[PDB]
Amino acid sequence: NEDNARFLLLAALIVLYLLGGAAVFSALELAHERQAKQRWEERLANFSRGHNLSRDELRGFLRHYEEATRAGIRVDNVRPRWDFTGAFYFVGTVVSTIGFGMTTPATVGGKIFLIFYGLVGCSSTILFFNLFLERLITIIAYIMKSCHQRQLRRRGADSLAGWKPSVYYVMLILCTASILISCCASAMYTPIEGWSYFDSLYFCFVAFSTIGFGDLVSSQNAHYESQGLYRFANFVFILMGVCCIYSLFNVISILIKQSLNWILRKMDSG
Amino acid sequence: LNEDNARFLLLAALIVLYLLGGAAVFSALELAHERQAKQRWEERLANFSRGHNLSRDELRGFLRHYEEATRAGIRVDNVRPRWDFTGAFYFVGTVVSTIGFGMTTPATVGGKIFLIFYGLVGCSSTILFFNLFLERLITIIAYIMKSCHQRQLRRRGASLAGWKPSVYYVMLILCTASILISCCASAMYTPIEGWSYFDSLYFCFVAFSTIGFGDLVSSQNAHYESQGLYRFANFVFILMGVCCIYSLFNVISILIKQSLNWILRKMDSG
Ligand SMILES: *[C@@H]1O[C@H](CO)[C@@H](O)[C@H](O)[C@H]1NC(C)=O
Ligand SMILES: *[C@@H]1O[C@H](CO)[C@@H](O)[C@H](O)[C@H]1NC(C)=O
Ligand SMILES: *[C@@H]1O[C@H](CO)[C@@H](O)[C@H](O)[C@H]1NC(C)=O
Ligand SMILES: *[C@@H]1O[C@H](CO)[C@@H](O)[C@H](O)[C@H]1NC(C)=O
Ligand SMILES: [K+]
Ligand SMILES: [K+]
Ligand SMILES: [K+]
Ligand SMILES: [K+]
Ligand SMILES: [K+]
């Protein structure tokens, strides 16, 4: 009954966390939401007044443009989707469960194949992230044991892997690595995309956490400088960042499980 | 080469080949539809320009304004207010579950900082919740088989649970439960939203696999019938479906790890 108690405690804590985050986000951005909607209403009113346009025909034109935007075409020189380069980035967002929504299937067969393709690839890439976390554990353990061996040799003048890093040490290493990759990717995105550095950090966290809002997406607009190299760099940075942030999520999940066990042990005593 | 390193490299190569093949087939399936939709959009824009006597630059500026509005949450057909507490709850649910449809995206500098700091803990806690749900599903299935064995022994006569179900049985149970949950959620979404049943199934897979394209989002348009019941039912179905598909991804990841071990044993033998 200790595992059921831990499950119920985690569910209650997550529900309370959801409520608190909803309240904080509402308090933070309801004013911005209202101001942006008011600015859009003012712009639409000026557009209708200046050019003598009815609201119904403008609404129909906006419906047509929404249908166009769902098809991938945008205002300012976005790359053509569903070519081999664009479909590769779409597949990278599908299989890594990022799913920006920059590229969505419209055919019936495309969505069926997306269902099967996700069912296989997303599982294989969850396995890939777990294997990457295990290899990072092994690499950190090997580095620590090699440093210990070098220290022993300097003083003197099978499975192995006896030394294992603590979960706090792995959290620190993964946090530092993710911060470094986010900073490097943002330093590449800022002069190329024109984003603010904080906007690039936010996009890096969103993509690396497999959240993928799609409000900011890296390589969508066309006519890049060194387009072949930039696409590869974006793919590699996104891959390492998603790996590191998902591994950090697993490590923090282990730590939160330990915290829940400690909380249950506190209430078990009295 | 190490056994784990060889498995890691083999999985990376298999995933890269999978991405290449999926990109090729997705391009082949969707490029014609994308070209047709872009041609339709260009025809509609030309009709709007030549009918209402509107310059291309002025329409481009108006569409830029509409894009800035849609980024806030403006849609052409009566969607719910954004960043209200009910909407912020949906957004936070999409954040912590790593779904991230993008119906509601932060634009405030403080909002995105809070998204990063909040979503770290939220996504880690929710991945831990998925792992705990999978473990509890294992325990429940094992308890069901134990109860069936006790019932058949009592009829024939007239912690334990060491015996755990095989990964094949868990895969079958999870995919059956996932199909049932997706069918129930789609049967809910089809009359409420007006989506096709296949479109509702596709949205169910996208939401439940935490891919979250955002092309289809469930409770966005306003003025539902019994909003409090529908929003709660949508949240419950999304939670259970995401848990089932994420646990299914974990189980298929275990299966693919076993297959990779078998392949490596095949190469090790000769
Ligand atoms: C819209 O309303 C009037 C029209 O000239 C103007 O004063 C106002 O600044 C306009 N706002 C925008 C955003 O165009
Ligand atoms: C606006 O367009 C309508 C439709 O042609 C017309 O009846 C009306 O007179 C126009 N208003 C102007 C030009 O102020
Ligand atoms: C839109 O443009 C196409 C291309 O000329 C034309 O065939 C069609 O009739 C137009 N539609 C309307 C409603 O004018
Ligand atoms: C609209 O029609 C008038 C006709 O007098 C013309 O002078 C003008 O260039 C056209 N275009 C715009 C954007 O006003
Ligand atoms: K995800
Ligand atoms: K995930
Ligand atoms: K996602
Ligand atoms: K997404
Ligand atoms: K999205």
Author numbering:
A (entry chain A): 14 to 170, 185 to 297
B (entry chain B): 13 to 170, 186 to 297
Pull text from the paper.
The TWIK-related Halothane Inhibited K+ channel (THIK1), named for the early observation that halothane and other volatile anesthetic (VA) agents inhibit THIK1 currents (1), is a K2P channel expressed in microglia (2), primary immune cells of the central nervous system (CNS). pmcTandem pore domain (K2P) potassium channels play vital roles across human physiology, conducting noninactivating potassium currents that set cellular resting membrane potentials. In response to inflammatory or infectious neuronal cues, THIK1 mediated efflux of potassium ions from the microglial cytoplasm modulates activation of the NLRP3 inflammasome and pharmacologic or genetic disruption of THIK1 activity decreases inflammasome-mediated production of the proinflammatory cytokine IL-1β. The overall structure of the THIK1 channel follows the canonical K2P architecture, featuring a dimeric channel assembly with a domain-swapped cap domain at the extracellular face of the channel, positioned above a central pore formed by the TM2 and TM4 helices.
To facilitate cryo-EM structure determination and anesthetic photolabeling studies, we purified a C-terminally truncated version of THIK1 (KCNK13), bearing residues 1 to 309 of the THIK1 protein sequence. Using cryo-EM, we solved a 3.2 Å structure of this THIK1EM channel construct. Our 3.2 Å THIK1 structure is in a putative closed conformation, due to the presence of an occlusive pore gate constituted by a pair of inward-facing TM4 tyrosine residues positioned directly below the potassium selectivity filter. Inwardly opposed Tyr273 sidechains arise from the pore-lining TM4 helixes and meet within the pore to form a central occlusive constriction ~6 Å below the THIK1 selectivity filter. In the presumed closed conformation we observe in the THIK1 structure, the Y-gate tyrosine residues limit the size of the ion conduction pathway to a diameter of less than 2 Å, precluding passage of potassium ions to the selectivity filter and dividing the inner pore into a large lower vestibule and a much smaller hydrophilic chamber directly below the selectivity filter. The cap domain of THIK1 contains two predicted N-glycosylation sites at Asp59 and Asp65 and in our THIK1 cryo-EM map we observe density consistent with glycosylation of both sites. Consistent with this notion, we observe EM density between the S4 selectivity filter Thr110 and Thr237 residues and the Y-gate in our cryo-EM map of THIK1. This “S5” site density is equivalently spaced and linearly aligned with the S1 to S4 potassium ion binding sites, and we therefore modeled this density as a potassium ion. A five-residue sequence, from Gly189 to Ser193, crosses the distal TM2 helix and adopts an inward-facing orientation previously unobserved in other K2P structures. In the THIK1 cryo-EM density map, we find a curved lipid-like density buried within the core of the THIK1 protein, directly behind the selectivity filter.
